[model samples]
Target: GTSKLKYVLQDARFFLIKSNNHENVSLAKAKGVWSTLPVNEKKLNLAFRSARSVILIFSVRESGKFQGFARLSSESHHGGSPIHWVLPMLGGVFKIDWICRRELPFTKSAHLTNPWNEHKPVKIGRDGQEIELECGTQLCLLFPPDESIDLYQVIHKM
Candidate 1:
């Protein structure tokens, strides 16, 4: 039982999605609604297949601050719907289950570095690029396991 739980936790990965509109971030946090982002379908599919769950870290473009985080479901509804609003140019919409807002003390610079000097800064994803990262380790460091509560429980309980 403990092994299964450990595997479930380990199977999930973390990603950073940057947004220029602070209002959108606020809206998602307030309503606990689905948020969409532009991502490479191939890459997204790879992430989906490899990980049991994908966690997203929301960052404000202007301030370059880590605001909050959310989790996405394995299933995706919008594949070829042009009518979908956000980022028409970049297709494929992966609906976020829910969002939680918390002010992380550090900026992007601190996030990339390791505790020891020998290691180089970690690179997740660049600005104006596809919204995903292999930064699960760093994410856990920022938001410890205890604090990173389950989105489903929070939404249903509220």
Candidate 2:
């Protein structure tokens, strides 16, 4: 219902997995597909690991009825795929930025290249319900809801 969800730095690995083009056959078999990631990145190459876990936030309209949902894949990705976040009117346009650690607040006019990099001049809060924050190197992210499941496969499925 709202369009202004802001956040701080999140792991970059999840973004990588979320951005992967290859659809998760497992998720698909379960019922849904990962969200449409803006980038196709990975974790292994980056030598990172997953920190945060997958969390889904289902929003309700003022009527208290289901009004779509949003999945906050706070985990980072270095070697993986993409997960889609359902927003209103944005039409696949979501911006993620973060603080460059406590000691180093970036002093510049800039924006985020990925969701986990939620660093900027903006003073966004971390409500956890509507926002997500993460740090450290990322490995892989798993966007949830078997809406298409999709996972922990490959090695065994392969």
Candidate 3:
């Protein structure tokens, strides 16, 4: 059962791909809207009551500044844990988050912070989970890379 089953929708149970080059791309070359890819069959229950997905680290020079999008709603009351089962299963994927601007991920976690004068009472949420925010969680790591300390001189200068 592991053989290109009609481009098996990204390990289904729920696989979403939303983009924000501003309202989902393609103003004539920026591409991504791709005719607003499937899920628009007569509005399919308003796209299954509004599906959601996100994992960003853009700054391909800064422009995709949504920086976040995770909303597996049926109302997780704005928490997480969704992306349930599938099969011809039209839909189910919501956990949810939306950071249009939180001081730009808090200045991208203070440009690689690490005990950076201890944030001194700051609690922001989105509890960040979209597979480790799409595979990146180094609000400046206390681990990960170490070879010449370029991750902001080991968690930002200070």
Candidate 4:
């Protein structure tokens, strides 16, 4: 199990179907409630339409041995919801930061916001094993898995 896992981003869409909410009440009533929510357009620059791909990198725990990786695709989301990365922590509070494309670096003092524009990394779970990173935009980002983020990696930008 020591083989470090690799993660990559791919093109996907999140669909909010009708009657997804409201229990006990009639289906018609639930649909009425759902219709009230505001809808936002999913505007994006379709630059990777042909490639349909993302990026990754790796190194030894010693941090010097670099090597090339590959595009290994897999599904993660459950029940059609957008998937997120879950990091299990052994103890204490953790800190994180995001980097833009091309090995850009950032510190904890400077942080990136989630899709909802929340400065705090999205708290996907109540337990210690439940930290997650979700991106709304496809910009490259590097995120290290721990309470303290590895500022040197890259991740998707907004």
Per-candidate RMSD vs. true structure?
A: 6.4, 14.9, 19.1, 17.6
Number of clashes in every candidate structure?
0, 38, 5, 12
lDDT by residue for model 3 (101-121), tens: 121334434344222224331
Give the least accurate 10-residue stretch of model 4, judged by summed lDDT.
33-42
**Deviation from native of the Cα of residue 6 in model 3, angstroms:** 38
User: Tens digit of lDDT per residue, candidate 4, span 1-158?
Assistant: 11122233435221111222223113212221111112211111122132333222221122222122122122111243221222211111111111111222223213434444334432211111111134322212333233333322422321
Deviating ranges (above 4 Å) for candidate 4: 1-72, 75-102, 108-111, 115-118, 121-158
Q: Candidate 3: deviation at residue 1, Å?
A: 46
Q: 16-68 in candidate 2: lDDT tens per residue? A: 22211122312322333233333321222122234332322221222221112
The Cα local distance difference test for each model comes to 0.50, 0.24, 0.25, 0.23
Against the true structure, candidate 1 has what lDDT?
0.50
List the candidate numbers ranked by TM-score, top first: 1, 3, 2, 4
Q: Model 4 reaches what TM-score against the true structure?
A: 0.19
